[PDB]
Write a protein that binds this ligand. Sequence first.
Ligand SMILES: Cc1cc2nc3c(=O)[nH]c(=O)nc-3n(C[C@H](O)[C@H](O)[C@H](O)COP(=O)(O)OP(=O)(O)OC[C@H]3O[C@@H](n4cnc5c(N)ncnc54)[C@H](O)[C@@H]3O)c2cc1C
Ligand SMILES: Cc1cc2nc3c(=O)[nH]c(=O)nc-3n(C[C@H](O)[C@H](O)[C@H](O)COP(=O)(O)OP(=O)(O)OC[C@H]3O[C@@H](n4cnc5c(N)ncnc54)[C@H](O)[C@@H]3O)c2cc1C
Lengths: 240, 247
Amino acid sequence: GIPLTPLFSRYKDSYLLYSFRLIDLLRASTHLTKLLSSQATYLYHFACLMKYKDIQKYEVQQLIEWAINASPDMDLQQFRIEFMDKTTELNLRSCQPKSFTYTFTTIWDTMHFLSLIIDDMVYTRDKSSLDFVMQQLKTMKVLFYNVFCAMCRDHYMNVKGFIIYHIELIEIALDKEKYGTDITFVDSYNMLMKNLMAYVSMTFHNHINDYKWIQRNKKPPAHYERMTWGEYKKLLNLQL
Amino acid sequence: GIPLTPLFSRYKDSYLLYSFRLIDLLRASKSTHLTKLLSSQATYLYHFACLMKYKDIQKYEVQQLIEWAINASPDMDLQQFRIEFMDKTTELNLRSCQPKSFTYTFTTIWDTMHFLSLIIDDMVYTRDKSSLDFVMQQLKTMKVLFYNVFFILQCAMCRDHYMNVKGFIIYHIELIEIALDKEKYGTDITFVDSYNNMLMKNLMAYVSMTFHNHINDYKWIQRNKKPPAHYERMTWGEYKKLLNLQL
Ligand SMILES: Cc1cc2nc3c(=O)[nH]c(=O)nc-3n(C[C@H](O)[C@H](O)[C@H](O)COP(=O)(O)OP(=O)(O)OC[C@H]3O[C@@H](n4cnc5c(N)ncnc54)[C@H](O)[C@@H]3O)c2cc1C
Ligand SMILES: Cc1cc2nc3c(=O)[nH]c(=O)nc-3n(C[C@H](O)[C@H](O)[C@H](O)COP(=O)(O)OP(=O)(O)OC[C@H]3O[C@@H](n4cnc5c(N)ncnc54)[C@H](O)[C@@H]3O)c2cc1C
């Protein structure tokens, strides 16, 4: 369970937009097609699981085949219109983003969103199904690895391991639990920080913004605020 | 400077061995993509070897060694390459770059990584404020070496795994770039011993040690094997002692 805050609601919507922009690439692509659809399937299974308490395996598959077979000459506006029709026919309208304005915030929101999910999924885990969670975590690493502005892509390629590293810390903690050592949640960075991925993605996010001034060799603007853990836990109303 | 210790000694030789086994790969490069990726990697490796061995990068003597390697017979074996290597390094007055031992293992790779970490910490800590641009270029070179690690030995699992979490290391080098950039524009670095413009002294040594334990903690989840009760894990307390790291 994750509090339903205004920021979280934007996160939920950005996720849908991200997913839309992802499946739109299927036409443009092999190995990549397999990787893309595999990622789009997970993203959409989880969206349906959240909206319908069911992954809707058949409807989601129908969505992916369509996107994979959509006209590669079709532009984004047309792909959207057809996407709105297809999801409608499939009774997957709740998987449609409310907004289609795609920006860096869409990607950031998506990355923070996944972090919140990882935290919650891990915390509300069921010792009976630790294997399930770990499989979910493996998929999460893949989602983060493939998030890759040519400049941004190069930088991300170089430091995305910071995030993936922490997901592995989680895998380790979980593997210890399945073998006798329950986890001990603490709220500071077999112990694990609660809201770990939320803190790591916030930190990663600030770092990326700190570094860009170095890439651009141009000093920060006047009103250049920085996100603090204390203020972030508030916007998402995180539990300590 | 980096304190002389039995562990740092092994590090220096391993680094030269790793550097040697890497250039040995040029003569065998099948494509241009790899050739220049190997030559760049090999160039930076030797640059830093010459820095710790001659206090100078030896930019031009090294470009000759690389030139040679790249154009060495892809027919002879490692034993023969070693022979031609020793003579060329001699001819270019770079004998200090010849390895004492040729036993190549994962330890050789870890030692090389921990060596660079120690190098990063020293060059930053003993930096000259008027040539920060120089130190930052060195760090950029360091990120390239950590991004492009060649295992040379066989272990797909390792390659894929390092490909996934190497950013944890590079991320920290960028934190150092940020610290230096700040010093460049007015705020001097303030060193502390724990993990404004504060920066942990011996940061990369701490970062590399931690990354190393992590990798070793994770291989059990990878091989679904049970860790032996004797599993020894490196502590920062112990590591500092082994390298005579200064606080
Ligand atoms: C994966 C990725 C890599 C990037 N790499 C680069 C790069 O190499 N070079 C470059 O110039 N730009 C890069 N960017 C873009 C850059 O990070 C900013 O998104 C963009 O410059 C807009 O800046 P902003 O300050 O207006 O917005 P942002 O600060 O990005 O706004 C993001 C949103 O989240 C909030 N937020 C701000 N900081 C945090 C935080 N630390 N934690 C959580 N939420 C936060 C804001 O309130 C806002 O709603 C990257 C973007 C992504 C998604
Ligand atoms: C970058 C990299 C990635 C790897 N990825 C994998 C992988 O995915 N899966 C896998 O099974 N193996 C992987 N390995 C190999 C693995 O880490 C070990 O090298 C190997 O399993 C042998 O372990 P060992 O028990 O001999 O100890 P090693 O860890 O190899 O010991 C080497 C030396 O380092 C010292 N040392 C030990 N821990 C530390 C530390 N934390 N800090 C500093 N020195 C330390 C030891 O005292 C010893 O002298 C990787 C190796 C490298 C270099």
